């Protein structure tokens, strides 16, 4: 489904910060003693409003809030770091946690190339059957 | 690839300690009140330098250090216990997290015995076709 932003305004540009992955190729910057402080590991950037995706993203954070808050109510963990790991596990259990019924809507097996695999070897004995 | 140890020396023997799995078969030692203290749960052993694997292992710890240090830079967790669990998840997502294209290099399906499964039932109707 599409996300239709129903907010009063939308800031169409995304001025972001994140950390720099492989933050130290060669050199000594990876050694903690020599590297940057906590404050100096971030990179910045600018994203534009192509396909209105930024405005789309803003509404989505909004819709997550209720469900996220209810999740935090049910745990006794003081700091929760595992939400994405649990999502990944749920992906795996959804697809292969059970029986794969072939041609069913919940089994992701495509046999068209597998059909050509069995159909080229039909003629290895069926055509030379003199 | 092989590991070629490029260190000044190699101690070829591995004098180790670990914990003793199923540390209490029958008896009361599993009950915390009666069992050993923290200091008494370890077993020890001696490994020799067969296939130079010990010298191989020593260099490997060395090569891990940079990547490990960079990982610790990016997390806000105070104590990280989940590295192997995340490795296991990545193994699973690498193989079955996507579409399995049969005969492709990233799909681990072997059909040789499956070929004999379909080739013995070729003759159940093709040979008695009078």
């Amino acid at each position: 489904e599409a996300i239709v932003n129903a907010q009063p305004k939308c800031n169409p540009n995304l001025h972001y910060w994140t950390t720099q992955d492989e933050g130290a190729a060669i050199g000594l910057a990876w050694i903690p003693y020599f590297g940057p402080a906590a404050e100096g590991i971030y990179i910045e950037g600018l994203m534009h409003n192509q396909d209105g995706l930024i405005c789309g993203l803003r509404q989505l954070a909004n819709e997550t809030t209720q469900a996220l808050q209810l999740f935090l109510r049910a745990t006794t963990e003081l700091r929760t770091f595992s939400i994405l790991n649990r999502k990944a596990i749920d992906f795996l259990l959804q697809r292969w946690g059970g029986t794969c019924h072939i041609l069913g809507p919940d089994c992701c097996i495509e046999p068209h190339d597998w059909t050509k695999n069995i159909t080229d070897k039909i003629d290895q004995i069926i055509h030379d059957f003199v | 690839e092989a590991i070629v140890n490029a260190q000044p020396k190699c101690n070829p023997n591995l004098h180790y300690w670990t914990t003793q799995d199923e540390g209490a078969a029958i008896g009361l030692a599993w009950i915390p009140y009666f069992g050993p203290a923290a200091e008494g749960i370890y077993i020890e052993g001696l490994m020799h330098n067969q296939d130079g694997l010990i010298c191989g292992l020593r260099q490997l710890a060395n090569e891990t250090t940079q990547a490990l240090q960079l990982f610790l830079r990016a997390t806000t967790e105070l104590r990280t216990f989940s590295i192997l669990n995340r490795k296991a998840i990545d193994f699973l997502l690498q193989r079955w997290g996507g579409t399995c294209h049969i005969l492709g290099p990233d799909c681990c399906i072997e059909p040789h015995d499956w070929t004999k499964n379909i080739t013995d039932k070729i003759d159940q109707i093709i040979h008695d076709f009078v």
Epitope: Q20, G27, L28, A29, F34, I43 | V4
Partner: antibody, heavy 114, light 104 residues
Framework: VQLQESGPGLVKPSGTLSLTCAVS?????????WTWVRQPPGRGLEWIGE???????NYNPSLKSRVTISVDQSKSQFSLKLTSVTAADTAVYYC?????????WGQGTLVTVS | IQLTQSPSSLSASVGDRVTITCRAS??????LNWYQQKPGKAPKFLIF???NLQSGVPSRFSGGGSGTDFTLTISSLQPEDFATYYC?????????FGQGTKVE
């Protein structure tokens, strides 16, 4: 750890440039990246490619269809091979060894075309 | 990624303080290999990780900088030091060199 280059002094066009970078005083294993640099005269230097001591070589995109690097640990040397050569790579060539603490340059070989 | 090295040519005398600039399009944060090269020869090192010397390099050179701006400074110049100078980033492949900076 010392490095030394070797190769011919002449190539012909539409041919193969072959370079042997021989290491002495150690071996190609470790936390050492092994890079190749070229410099046509009176200029700056131009990065070519590199290798690590396990596999999967790395490259430069303007050369990435016609350059191969290969390591031999027994004799402990490099073969760098350029194919489909032109008249725009006559240069003094170098093999650099780059590490986390330093590195070391070689002696450089003059290679022309004709 | 490409770097910009200023200025393209210099000339000075004995007793001054000379400064050569290497400036990156991005942020790389310590990764600068400064080198020195006389004509016909092969380049020696000067300074790796933008601040620390190598063993065999005199005690009057100095480096510095991070983020996107890196400098090299030579104090109390002698008539030995006429050589082209260079800088290389190591932050990701393909690594890239500057365009030289003549000293005389």
């Amino acid at each position: 750890v010392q490095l030394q280059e070797s190769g011919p002094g002449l190539v012909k066009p539409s041919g193969t440039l072959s370079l042997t970078c021989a290491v002495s005083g150690g071996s190609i294993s470790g936390t050492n990246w092994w890079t190749w640099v070229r410099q046509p005269p009176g200029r700056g230097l131009e990065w070519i490619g590199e290798i690590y001591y396990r596999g999967s070589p790395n490259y430069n995109p303007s050369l990435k269809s016609r350059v191969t690097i290969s390591v031999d640990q027994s004799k402990s040397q490099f073969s760098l091979k350029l194919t489909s050569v032109t008249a725009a790579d006559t240069a003094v060539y170098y093999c650099l060894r780059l590490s986390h603490y330093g590195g070391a340059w070689g002696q450089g070989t003059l290679v022309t075309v004709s | 990624i490409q770097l910009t090295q200023s200025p393209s040519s210099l000339s000075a005398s004995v007793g001054d303080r000379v400064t050569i600039t290497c400036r990156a399009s991005q942020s790389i944060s310590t990764y600068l290999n400064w080198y020195q090269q006389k004509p016909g020869k092969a380049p020696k090192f000067l300074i790796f990780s933008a601040s620390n010397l190598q063993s065999g390099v005199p005690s009057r050179f100095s480096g510095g900088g991070s983020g996107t701006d890196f400098t090299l400074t030579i104090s109390s110049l002698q008539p030995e030091d006429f050589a082209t100078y260079y800088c290389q980033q190591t932050y990701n492949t393909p690594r890239t060199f500057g365009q030289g900076t003549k000293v005389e």
